[PDB]
Nucleic acid binder design. Structure first.
Ligand SMILES: [Mg+2]
Length: 112
RNA sequence: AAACUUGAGUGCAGAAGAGGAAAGUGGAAUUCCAUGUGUAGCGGUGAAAUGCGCAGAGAUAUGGAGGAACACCAGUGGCGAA
């Protein structure tokens, strides 16, 4: 039984991943678009992200979690959908996208 | 040959600068490593597959190693012969 928690959202252009934990960082339940049998372009849709945070939150509340914080990441479109649905699963809502200070060289641009 | 001070230098008084060389200090991020939680995919594309993963990945939290580069400031802004 844990009541205070943190919800991590990792939304990219290929997949949305949600991990729920306390403030101590130890996870309790996670889901993703792939865990719901979505493949490819389906795995990145904003609708398909909400089906993942809803699944994740229901498992964390089963442990007894009521208040969870939000840490969002990535430019994936499944950001509002995965965050609003956090408040839509009986969870009380009380940006961590890594930016470098000019560090490592990024890969070459794609000539599609 | 002799004068001159405008050109060109010097002196004096101010100011600005990513100009150069050397040695130090620091924060973010990437990768790898370890540890704790924790479970079924992660990753990737037009769509896929190769690839990694149940021997515990990816995610998350903490710590460590190492190299490289210096967000914001930042501007037909500045400096330099290039
Ligand atoms: Mg002077």
């Amino acid at each position: 039984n844990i009541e205070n928690g943190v919800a991590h959202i990792r939304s990219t252009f290929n997949n949305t991943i949600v991990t729920i934990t306390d403030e101590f960082g130890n996870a309790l339940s996670w889901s993703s678009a792939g865990a719901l049998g979505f493949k490819g372009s389906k795995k990145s849709t904003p609708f398909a992200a909400q089906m993942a945070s809803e699944t994740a939150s229901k498992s964390a509340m089963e442990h007894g979690l009521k208040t969870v914080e939000v840490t969002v990441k990535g430019p994936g479109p499944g950001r509002e959908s995965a965050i609003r649905a956090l408040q839509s699963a009986g969870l009380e809502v009380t940006d961590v996208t890594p930016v470098p200070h000019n560090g490592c060289r990024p890969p070459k641009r794609r000539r599609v």
